[PDB]
Design an enzyme around this catalytic site. Structure first.
Site, PDB file in Angstrom:
ATOM      1  CB  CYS B 316      -0.928   0.012   1.212  1.00 47.87           C
ATOM      2  SG  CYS B 316      -0.005   0.051   2.753  1.00 47.87           S
ATOM      3  CB  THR B 318       0.827   3.944   4.171  1.00 47.71           C
ATOM      4  OG1 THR B 318      -0.361   4.666   3.857  1.00 47.71           O
ATOM      5  CG2 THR B 318       1.377   4.440   5.486  1.00 47.71           C
TER       6      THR B 318
END
Ligand code: GTP
Ligand code: GTP
Ligand code: GTP
Ligand code: GTP
Lengths: 424, 424, 424, 424
Positions: B316, B318
């Site tokens: 992801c 992040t």
């Protein structure tokens, strides 16, 4: 090497392109696609769903008719099964519903739901007529899904129904479409029963049917407002019994369909079907054939339409197992030359992969095309989606091909089209 | 190498399995899945559709509520757009329809069709109430699609409508569900308007809503019978204006949602939303967080629910861009330990790939799971099919997981579940 | 099996995630990324282009400096070649151009074009100063591409040049940036030569440089306004001669770079470079190392910075051929613990695949990261595009990682970051 | 992160290897593999064919028994169907054939062929005994395929049969294997009927069975010489009726098999099966379980064997849908520790991919392994070939594993094996 040099050459759809002609067409809507399926059956669009157990059963036959084409019910099933599909297609819509579904006043809401989801019609029926008994069928009232939405499973039909004295009824067994329309408008009702001199139920006219009869003026309908449908038979001794039960179940044409139609079995079957009053009341279509002499033979046997195609696809059982077949464009050219002179419509059956191919089939003399693969795996076939839009685009392609030949009708497309042959 | 040896280890869903416990469960239907979304919002099933512009807009929020879950409307759109989705969800069903769609008697059948296909509700509305004018709204009659099916585009609404004197009307602004049911049964009608002392239209009750209120007793409803829905806000100065307009449009909870919820911006936003009467009338959910101290902070700021998950998925943005995140099972374990002691429900958000993962999320202390990927590309998301059956199977998986922990309820699942850790 | 149980475990970047901390950061622009490359060299961004013959030559070193980082020129070339790249980088921009390109008044327009496309600077130079002879360099005028656009290849430079009496000249060898800016504004000129008491050309100040000095305040500049650049040396007897010629060509730091920096060859090289005034005037960076004791040794030898990384990548020659290496996060943790206490900056070199990894490298104590693969195949490397935007996004990722640790500066990122370890 | 650190770790087969021990084994044939299936059922090889509708029906159960293992007939079929498979397995071989197939002297050769290809035994039967009538069964003669090879379909059985006075008959209802062997040798016959005092047919002994009883001394046989077979039941009210009909059809053990055996439904089923004389005459095996406490519970309920495995495979419905399971080596270790102390054999069920895994299962305490995937798609399962050689190689692998632990028997394999854990 002379013996090889003298073998003639056959062309399939992929060998040719339609040559662009002078076109006076000034609007896409000027192109008319109505055609003949057989000597006595016209169609608004020249599309026939193939009589394959992967393509055409009840749902496919219904959808094709609604588009203005037709489906041929396949014969790979029991006579009872094939007639059952037929009866359902005929049950899909009508003007006067013969023998409308009834129910008795002391039955329950649960039994009403079951009546409304009758398996005699895909989707069930829109109402049940409440009558006094199965013997007499005196109309007491009407019950719809709307009437059940707040009932407990055990409530009486009589508690829930609209009583007959609050209904709009007619005794006019010859009521016209404008007449019953007016009845529905004045009475704000959606069902008009036709009853006899003593209140006995004879027919039902539904708002649902009236609306279809006013909108889709393209549908293929028999004289009673029902969807047109055809059914296939073989040539064995028992196929005659199948043919008779199919005609009686409502078939509008019979299709004699064996892989090798230029055979004595096929001719004799045609002679048989035509020589029996139980089957000679519908057109007899025969096939499959690929030569002029075959076309001659079947026409001479009495056929009302020919189905063209023996080993039409590049990889099909007939070619790989027997080594036989004719490239489909040559076969359509040869057969329709004979048939045109005799007034016998031809179905180009097999080998069509795109709407462009349909235009070539018509251009080469066919009156209709039959589709298997392109229609299998649609929703209405027994993933591609619903068949309706696929059919509509196919007809769109054909209209476009027609404009390239500068044709405003099927006859013109057949008379005007010129081909050019490709290679690599 | 000592500094490396002291880094703790975090677990994701794929590291653990639920250990089978002694189960007294003697029927699949004994397992209750009701839970809390926030301090003051219960849900029949613990499923929340993620506030992603690929997952949850009007159609998704409607479907989730009907399943007994809820959807959070995403904030990646204009305030006006986000309120518009909200209003539509609230318009999907109700008991008393406020401000029902009207039409005037001298309008045409064409204008009626347009009224019936109002864009304020997905699918339009089931009827139009014919009133004397927009100012006074004196009820003269009613018009439905059924009333138009045989009309020409220019016919007057007055020619076609059921007049009010043939309708069933009520003046009881407090009518109960049993009362209006009886009215609909006695009168065989499907719409009961509520009018005032002088015949002015106030509300509409429809048979369609009464039926939903009797059947799907699982739906997430506000006090007016409308579907429950929540909406997300950011933390910028303008998100406060967004929050106020969302509450006024009907939001049942607000979700403060930024990637890094353990921040002063997020805490202050929570304090702000709670300290303003325009927004403190709905529960304030906040996130996203992954640590106990973060959970402490947000709870102390006043949050009514926590959304757990910072870098929950294996790949992801992040993790790949910032290098930050917490394996989601550890994060759920750490945060709910703090929150349980404070009575604050937790949404496990992200990293769930299968219904088995949902069972682990609950087992690890969460009260709800939030789903993005598993729900994107369903029909109701802005190919997988309709979301309803996917959700129902997910809840089925969870119930099965619950039985493996021998739990008959969500609390028990949280108290009873034991994990075992895998490797290769 | 006890001997195996006692082998310690090393962690690479992919074993850990940065744990989200409390963040008071209220704006992305509050995060400062300036750092140290070595004891005496600061950088605005902690990015170093690796001294690989596939990554860092003149163009790469120029671009890195302009971004606020730096490049290390690789040593896999001749001393002359490596100094030539160095000289070109230093030629890229300046405040006072030493030895500006000249031309003589009786040379041709063709010779002027050749002068303007000097290979001493990528892109050539913006003007030629017309002087009386190479010996005296008395300034007679100036010639630019603009002055040639309508000339025939054989026209005299003197026919085309702006004569000196129409130029803006200065005798102020200490002119400030504000001063020469004013000169350029008043005189509407883009080149101001600095001449001596007798009109002899000493320096050139160009509008192009003044503009860069006012805009990109992030660039890595030496005291003369030139781009910062470093260069690598080996440890063989001849690398000392290379080091001396590199310092004299303008190198701002020297990087002793061998695969196994914890060796006597490497230490002695550091002692040598520091003990010779020809090389001790720039910082000496040394590596590569992976242990605390190695860090101790090199620092004790006098190193001004350490380069960390021995077998850092999962598949690299060092691991596959020799079987040696240290997982890079452990190596950065071990080495910077020693170096922090001594005030010696550390370059984390190798194994970085994403901007998330850069944040972990800094979080684990590094002051800069060195990039090979991520920068190879950019335009400025000897397809990915231009390196500038890749670098800017990398720094963006790092800033985002910094905010997850709630750090507003590099020191804080090192002091605050906490890791959590993953598995599957 | 403490809550995560305290989750225990479970091991599957692929986590461990058998550590090579000191082996005194001086011949592959010294390794004995006989074991117990349940408290009262021994097996020559520890292989059980899984009660899966893709693995174990009649043919699989026959083959397993002949190899010296056993198959469990699955319960995903009607009671009648499951008993029918059972009866056929029992019909496969015997010593005294009860109720041997008969025929009457005035039946035709066509009816004889049909009798010989009886569907009560896979492959039919080897002869028909010609008796006077179904009521009395006075033996008149015998008819085999050999007797029909030159007959016309309508010839009388009496014309073709060997008459009884030329047969070898016995009245010894307790005849031994040596006795009837001698009868077959002296009389050169291949069928010896046993008749009663008045010539009525009671049993049949065939040379085919005598040969099997002398050769494959490894077969799993009940006391009558028939192949051993077991059958599975559920826990619903109706499974008790299934259990009773299975025992009466000849089942040698019953296997209570639900996914979650540590449940009250499963325990109560075990108590029920043990507390009814109609079912307590065979061993009751129960599962599936994965914990020591579960093993305790079922043993305490009365189980004669435990089936171990809840979510044993890496990708199985239980793990993906519910999120539950135990790595299978831990589960076998935990359960057999409890069961050994109680004398209750354990079937390791699921997760076995190679013969090496079987050795680990036994090494970890199991008494038998159950195989699904490895046996599906063999000829005898409902492409891999015949199951016999696959089973024989599996047992070969196990013997080899046994020698690596220096074990000459199953008990020793369980007591001696030591594991070592892998990683990457
Ligand atoms: N009510 C009724 N409809 C029938 C019956 N048999 C066939 N139908 C057809 O089923 C339809 C019934 O109306 P709806 O239920 O509204 O069908 P739909 O709107 O096309 O779906 C009409 O098209 C009828 O012609 C019958 O026995 N009763
Ligand atoms: N008639 C009407 N329905 C409304 C209105 N606003 C929302 N609705 C909802 O729309 C539905 C109208 O009935 P239908 O058209 O039969 O809707 P459906 O059967 O769910 O499709 C009801 O659920 C109403 O609550 C309105 O203004 N008029
Ligand atoms: N005119 C000139 N420029 C030089 C010389 N040496 C280096 N330069 C650099 O080259 C640039 C010349 O100006 P331009 O040709 O406009 O370069 P640019 O706009 O960056 O492309 C300035 O940045 C100078 O510092 C030189 O000898 N003469
Ligand atoms: N002859 C006979 N054999 C039976 C009967 N029922 C089961 N069998 C078995 O079927 C086999 C009959 O002999 P064959 O036909 O030679 O069988 P096969 O050689 O194993 O093949 C013996 O193993 C019998 O035990 C029966 O009723 N009659």
């Amino acid at each position: 090497f002379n013996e090889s040099a003298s073998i003639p050459t056959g062309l399939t759809y992929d060998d040719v392109l339609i040559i662009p002609q002078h076109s006076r067409v000034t609007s896409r809507k000027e192109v008319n696609t109505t055609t003949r399926l057989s000597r006595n059956v016209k169609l608004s669009i020249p599309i026939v769903a193939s009589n394959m157990d992967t393509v055409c059963e009840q749902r496919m036959a219904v959808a094709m008719a609604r588009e203005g084409g037709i489906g041929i019910l396949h014969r790979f099933c029991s006579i009872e099964e094939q007639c059952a599909m037929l009866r359902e297609v005929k049950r899909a819509q009508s003007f006067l519903i013969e023998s409308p579904r009834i129910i008795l006043p002391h039955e329950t809401a649960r039994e009403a739901w079951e009546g409304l989801n009758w398996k005699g019609r895909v989707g069930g029926v829109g109402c049940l007529l409440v009558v006094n008994c199965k013997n007499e069928r005196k109309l007491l009232g009407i019950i719809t899904r709307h009437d059940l939405k707040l009932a407990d499973e055990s409530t009486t039909v009589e508690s829930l129904m609209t009583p007959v004295d609050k209904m709009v009824v007619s005794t006019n067994t010859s009521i016209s479409l404008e007449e019953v329309t007016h009845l529905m408008r004045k009475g704000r009702t959606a069902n008009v029963p036709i009853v006899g001199q003593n209140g006995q139920l004879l027919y039902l006219v539904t708002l649902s049917d009236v609306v279809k009869l006013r909108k889709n003026k393209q549908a293929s309908l028999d004289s009673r407002g029902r969807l047109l449908v055809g059914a296939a038979v073989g040539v064995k001794k028992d196929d005659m019994n199948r043919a008779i039960r199919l005609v009686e179940a409502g078939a509008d044409v019979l299709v004699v369909d064996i892989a090798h139609g230029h055979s004595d079995l096929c001719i004799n079957m045609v002679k048989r079907l035509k020589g029996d009053p139980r089957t000679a009341s519908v057109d007899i279509i025969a096939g499959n054939i690929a030569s002029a002499e075959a076309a001659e033979a079947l026409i001479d046997a009495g056929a009302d339409g020919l189905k063209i195609g023996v080993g039409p696809g590049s990889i099909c059982i007939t070619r790989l197992v027997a080594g036989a077949g004719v490239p489909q464009l040559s076969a359509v050219l040869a057969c329709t030359r004979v048939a045109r002179r005799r007034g016998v419509p031809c179905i180009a059956d097999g080998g069509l992969r795109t709407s462009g191919d349909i235009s070539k089939a018509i251009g080469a003399g066919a009156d209709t095309v039959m589709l298997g693969n392109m229609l299998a795996g649609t929703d209405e076939a027994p993933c591609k989606g619903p068949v309706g839009p696929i059919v509509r685009q196919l007809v769109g392609g054909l209209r476009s091909g027609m404009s390239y030949s500068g044709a405003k009708s099927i006859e013109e497309m057949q008379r005007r089209t010129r081909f050019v042959r490709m290679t690599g």
